[PDB]
Amino acid sequence: QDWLTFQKKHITNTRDVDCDNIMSTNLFHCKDKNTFIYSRPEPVKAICKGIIASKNVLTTSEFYLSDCNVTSRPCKYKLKKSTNKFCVTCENQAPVHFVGVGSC
Amino acid sequence: QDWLTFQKKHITNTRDVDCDNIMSTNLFHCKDKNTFIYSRPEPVKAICKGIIASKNVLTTSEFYLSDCNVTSRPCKYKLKKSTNKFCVTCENQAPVHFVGVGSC
């Protein structure tokens, strides 16, 4: 019916995450906070290159990060966009957990 | 907990739509089929550059497209990935409806 509805129905990456739609999906289940990384999988998996034993690792470079943070209205959110380093748990050479922005 | 779950929860640009998550939202309500354009909205809005009066336009080039196609199990989906042209209804220099893949 209109540009914004066309985007929501028929476009997949405005690196301007749709907090209120994505966080109310059954994967995020109206949780307080989630951070999305604007990147292909490959540069992100590479963080864990040659780490086997469970270990927390900080990226050597910055990525575009979209944070969804819940307001006072249940399952309603405000989008924060930044570039920064982040920390993941590496297990058998792959990211298995998001630990934090800026610092492990 | 694992690389695959990490990607679904934190990676924005996987080229792989999470059909079973996305299609069971208010927006898609477990409908048989939806087509997603993998792009930022800018080159999609530009299709309608300087068209005011409602009109169907076929893209001049191909875009990465991802169809969610329902299985015989209600609201379980299979992803089909392709590149192709598509038709949109332009109104006031913006896409408002998705008419179809390959032709109007």
From Swiss-Prot, chains A, B:
The active site is at 10 (proton acceptor), 97 (proton donor). The keyword Cytoplasm does not apply. The modification Pyrrolidone carboxylic acid is found at residue 1. It holds the Pfam family RnaseA. GO terms for molecular function: endonuclease activity; nucleic acid binding; RNA nuclease activity. Keywords: Disulfide bond, Endonuclease, Hydrolase, Nuclease, Pyrrolidone carboxylic acid. GO terms for biological process: defense response to Gram-positive bacterium. It is an enzyme of class 3 (hydrolase). Disulfide bonds join 19-68, 30-75, 48-90, 87-104. Substrate binds at residues 31-35. InterPro entries: RNaseA, RNaseA-like_dom_sf, RNaseA_AS, RNaseA_domain. Its EC number is 3.1.27.-. Basic protein with antiproliferative/cytotoxic activity against several tumor cell lines in vitro, as well as antitumor in vivo. It exhibits a ribonuclease-like activity against high molecular weight ribosomal RNA. Belongs to the pancreatic ribonuclease family. This is Protein P-30. It comes from Lithobates pipiens (Northern leopard frog).
